[PDB]
Design an enzyme around this catalytic site. Structure first.
Site, mmCIF file in Angstrom:
data_model
loop_
_atom_site.group_PDB
_atom_site.id
_atom_site.type_symbol
_atom_site.label_atom_id
_atom_site.label_comp_id
_atom_site.label_asym_id
_atom_site.label_seq_id
_atom_site.Cartn_x
_atom_site.Cartn_y
_atom_site.Cartn_z
ATOM 1 N N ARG A 116 0.433 7.879 -7.204
ATOM 2 C CA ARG A 116 0.991 7.568 -5.883
ATOM 3 C C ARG A 116 1.266 6.073 -5.738
ATOM 4 N NH1 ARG A 116 -4.405 9.389 -5.352
ATOM 5 N NH2 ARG A 116 -5.825 8.348 -3.874
ATOM 6 N N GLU B 294 -7.803 3.633 -6.008
ATOM 7 C CA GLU B 294 -8.420 3.953 -4.725
ATOM 8 C C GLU B 294 -9.938 4.060 -4.873
ATOM 9 O OE1 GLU B 294 -8.724 3.617 -1.610
ATOM 10 O OE2 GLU B 294 -6.906 4.712 -1.076
ATOM 11 N N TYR C 230 -14.287 8.847 -4.000
ATOM 12 C CA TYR C 230 -14.983 9.436 -2.898
ATOM 13 C C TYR C 230 -16.033 10.405 -3.417
ATOM 14 C CZ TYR C 230 -12.445 7.244 0.840
ATOM 15 O OH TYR C 230 -12.017 6.273 1.790
ATOM 16 N N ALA D 68 0.427 14.255 -1.094
ATOM 17 C CA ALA D 68 0.355 15.702 -0.884
ATOM 18 C C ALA D 68 -0.995 16.123 -0.323
ATOM 19 C CB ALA D 68 0.631 16.438 -2.195
ATOM 20 N N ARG E 213 -19.391 4.447 8.867
ATOM 21 C CA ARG E 213 -19.588 3.112 9.421
ATOM 22 C C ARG E 213 -20.101 2.092 8.408
ATOM 23 N NH1 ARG E 213 -24.615 5.653 11.831
ATOM 24 N NH2 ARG E 213 -26.295 4.604 10.677
ATOM 25 N N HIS F 81 -3.730 0.546 -3.528
ATOM 26 C CA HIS F 81 -4.319 1.472 -2.579
ATOM 27 C C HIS F 81 -5.042 0.696 -1.489
ATOM 28 C CE1 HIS F 81 -3.689 4.766 -5.558
ATOM 29 N NE2 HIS F 81 -3.907 3.790 -6.421
ATOM 30 N N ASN G 85 -8.149 0.653 -0.301
ATOM 31 C CA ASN G 85 -9.463 0.026 -0.485
ATOM 32 C C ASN G 85 -9.460 -1.077 -1.552
ATOM 33 O OD1 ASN G 85 -11.605 1.359 1.288
ATOM 34 N ND2 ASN G 85 -10.455 3.128 0.535
ATOM 35 N N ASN H 71 -2.961 14.204 1.597
ATOM 36 C CA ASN H 71 -3.050 13.788 2.994
ATOM 37 C C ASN H 71 -2.571 14.894 3.923
ATOM 38 O OD1 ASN H 71 -2.021 10.472 2.043
ATOM 39 N ND2 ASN H 71 -4.108 11.230 2.409
ATOM 40 N N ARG I 18 0.853 -1.184 0.000
ATOM 41 C CA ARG I 18 0.000 0.000 0.000
ATOM 42 C C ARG I 18 0.892 1.238 0.000
ATOM 43 N NH1 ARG I 18 -4.232 1.796 4.912
ATOM 44 N NH2 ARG I 18 -4.776 3.796 3.918
ATOM 45 N N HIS I 19 0.599 2.199 -0.878
ATOM 46 C CA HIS I 19 1.405 3.413 -0.914
ATOM 47 C C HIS I 19 1.205 4.226 0.367
ATOM 48 C CE1 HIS I 19 -1.917 6.199 -1.314
ATOM 49 N NE2 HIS I 19 -2.478 5.300 -2.101
ATOM 50 N N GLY I 20 2.155 5.124 0.625
ATOM 51 C CA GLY I 20 2.140 5.984 1.788
ATOM 52 C C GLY I 20 1.550 7.356 1.515
ATOM 53 N N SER J 264 -8.878 12.322 -1.377
ATOM 54 C CA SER J 264 -8.289 12.215 -2.708
ATOM 55 C C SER J 264 -9.105 11.307 -3.620
ATOM 56 C CB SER J 264 -6.851 11.694 -2.609
ATOM 57 O OG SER J 264 -6.047 12.579 -1.853
HETATM 58 S S1 LIG Z 1 -10.748 6.308 2.643
HETATM 59 O O1 LIG Z 1 -9.492 6.704 1.890
HETATM 60 O O2 LIG Z 1 -10.407 4.897 3.062
HETATM 61 C C1 LIG Z 1 -10.993 7.244 4.139
HETATM 62 C C2 LIG Z 1 -10.244 8.371 4.456
HETATM 63 C C3 LIG Z 1 -10.492 9.047 5.650
HETATM 64 C C4 LIG Z 1 -11.480 8.600 6.523
HETATM 65 C C5 LIG Z 1 -12.214 7.466 6.195
HETATM 66 S S2 LIG Z 1 -13.507 6.827 7.242
HETATM 67 O O3 LIG Z 1 -13.556 7.496 8.523
HETATM 68 O O4 LIG Z 1 -13.245 5.468 7.633
HETATM 69 N N1 LIG Z 1 -14.934 6.914 6.427
HETATM 70 C C6 LIG Z 1 -15.462 8.156 5.955
HETATM 71 C C7 LIG Z 1 -15.318 9.298 6.726
HETATM 72 C C8 LIG Z 1 -15.833 10.506 6.276
HETATM 73 C C9 LIG Z 1 -15.685 11.745 7.129
HETATM 74 C C10 LIG Z 1 -15.175 11.698 8.426
HETATM 75 C C11 LIG Z 1 -15.143 13.017 9.063
HETATM 76 C C12 LIG Z 1 -15.817 14.001 7.975
HETATM 77 C C13 LIG Z 1 -16.079 13.077 6.677
HETATM 78 C C14 LIG Z 1 -16.505 10.561 5.066
HETATM 79 C C15 LIG Z 1 -16.653 9.424 4.290
HETATM 80 C C16 LIG Z 1 -16.124 8.219 4.731
HETATM 81 C C17 LIG Z 1 -16.298 6.986 3.874
HETATM 82 O O5 LIG Z 1 -16.754 7.098 2.705
HETATM 83 O O6 LIG Z 1 -16.002 5.839 4.318
HETATM 84 C C18 LIG Z 1 -11.966 6.795 5.011
#
Ligand SMILES: *S(=O)(=O)c1cccc(S(=O)(=O)Nc2cc(C3=CCCC3)ccc2C(=O)O)c1
Ligand SMILES: *S(=O)(=O)c1cccc(S(=O)(=O)Nc2cc(C3=CCCC3)ccc2C(=O)O)c1
Ligand SMILES: [Cl-]
Lengths: 237, 249
Positions: free
Chosen positions: B60, B87, B90, B13, B115, B184, B186, B15, B8-10, B21
């Site tokens: 990435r 990835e 979103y 920019a 969740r 990535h 997911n 982040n 998995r990449h780290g 992203s």
């Molecule tokens: S993704 O790249 O795996 C990811 C990145 C950051 C956070 C999550 S999560 O908390 O597991 N899920 C999630 C969170 C949020 C928000 C949290 C605070 C404001 C918005 C929005 C959407 C998601 C989601 O689609 O799972 C996952």
């Protein structure tokens, strides 16, 4: 007209030592890396877009391609690697510098190999320092015993490069895909010789610039409509 | 019978801006590049060899693969890129930070999305600032209208990643090729859920470290002999897995 772009990699680590690399997998020097960066920026500034890339299995060419794709923001393109785009195999000269080569093989033989299209250097034999490094590299494991060279003349290099041009690159061009080829002086010489119908004497007199995008405009029969052109500001060319 | 490696990449920019992203093509930060170098050096020190590599069309992940191949002296390997390892998409959250997402969409929807396995984020519409940048990028020009996502739940991401696993990766493994997958969080979760038979709940809670090579030993039917194992110094791995477990909590 179809658009084809070639790039020859720049200076390698063994260029700095005046040593014959051939199939030895020498990396780019910092300067050779910078050359690839400048060639990539010339392509970016001209707005070039590609659909597929071809390179050798040698890291100085692969890293040139990577640098260009980074510069033009096309890191996502399909890349195909083939030993058939490798540099000429310099046989027993591999790893020698100029002085060592002259001392071991003589001025007469050196001039012969230098000016000849079809006389190969000495073979790389099992006691050669780079024999295991190259001939037992697993990246050549699928070559038949008659394909893995112990040495190559320019004629030999062109003879094993052109099947890849004819059987893989040409169909891609004919389906309209915009091809970038990142490779080596002598394998690209094979492509140029074929495209332009050059004589042996003519292709030996041709030195392609390094780090400079080389642009061809090809008609429906893949014949160039005009001489190869170069990308970049005029002084760099 | 077979050995499989995932990475998995780290950090990217975006982040460092706490921005979603997804399919936006953000590049690695210096820290993300360093994690790729450390994973590559771990593979080099253990003598790992590959015969074919798979990655996404996102830089990435591609740059992580490049850094690993450089470290292990295997830049000559064949590389295959596919959007199916991208990835999670979103959707309309792309480009937003957490405060902006909460303001625009509400804490209630945020809680649901975070969740949920199968409730997608909002669609990325043509008025979205990154719609043209992503949905009209020519790298997706060959996707059917049904294949190009406007948004993805984790279930959606897994559903479009596993066809590539089944159709393109599994036959390479069965031929005996040593496969490296650089992708990535997911999309790799899809592969892990499939291999290990994990539940939706477990795969959403699973800790997937960045830059640490993830190693599977598989039997002749591609069933893991053991669950995923991590390559690297034990104490570096231990601290990294404590970190990701803490981030989940
Ligand atoms: S993704 O790249 O795996 C990811 C990145 C950051 C956070 C999550 S999560 O908390 O597991 N899920 C999630 C969170 C949020 C928000 C949290 C605070 C404001 C918005 C929005 C959407 C998601 C989601 O689609 O799972 C996952
Ligand atoms: S090759 O990669 O194109 C290449 C690399 C280095 C030098 C040459 S060359 O000078 O054009 N030809 C050549 C020279 C020599 C020697 C010169 C001084 C001592 C040995 C030996 C062999 C060759 C050759 O076979 O091309 C080309
Ligand atoms: Cl590549």
């Amino acid at each position: 007209a179809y658009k084809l772009v070639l790039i020859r990699h720049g200076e390698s680590a063994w260029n700095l030592e005046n040593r014959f690399s051939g199939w030895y997998d020498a990396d780019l020097s910092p300067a050779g890396h910078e050359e690839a960066k400048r060639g990539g920026q010339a392509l970016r500034d001209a707005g070039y877009e590609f659909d597929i890339c071809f390179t050798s299995v040698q890291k100085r060419a692969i890293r040139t391609l990577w640098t260009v794709l980074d510069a033009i923001d096309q890191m996502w393109l399909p890349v195909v690697r083939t030993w058939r785009l490798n540099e000429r195999h310099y046989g027993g000269l591999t790893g020698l510098n100029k002085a060592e080569t002259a001392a071991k093989h003589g001025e007469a033989q050196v001039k012969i190999w230098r000016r000849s299209y079809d006389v190969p250097p000495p073979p790389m034999e099992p006691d050669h320092p780079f024999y295991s490094n190259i001939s037992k590299d697993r990246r050549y494991a699928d070559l038949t015993e008659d394909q893995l060279p112990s040495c190559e003349s320019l004629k030999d290099t062109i003879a094993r490069a052109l099947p890849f041009w004819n059987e893989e690159i040409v169909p891609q061009i004919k389906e309209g895909k915009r091809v970038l080829i990142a490779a080596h002086g002598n394998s690209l010489r094979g492509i140029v010789k074929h495209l332009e119908g050059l004589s042996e004497e003519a292709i030996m007199e041709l030195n392609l610039p390094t780090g400079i995008p080389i642009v061809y405009e090809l008609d429906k029969n893949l014949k160039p409509i005009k001489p190869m052109q170069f990308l970049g500001d005029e002084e760099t060319v």
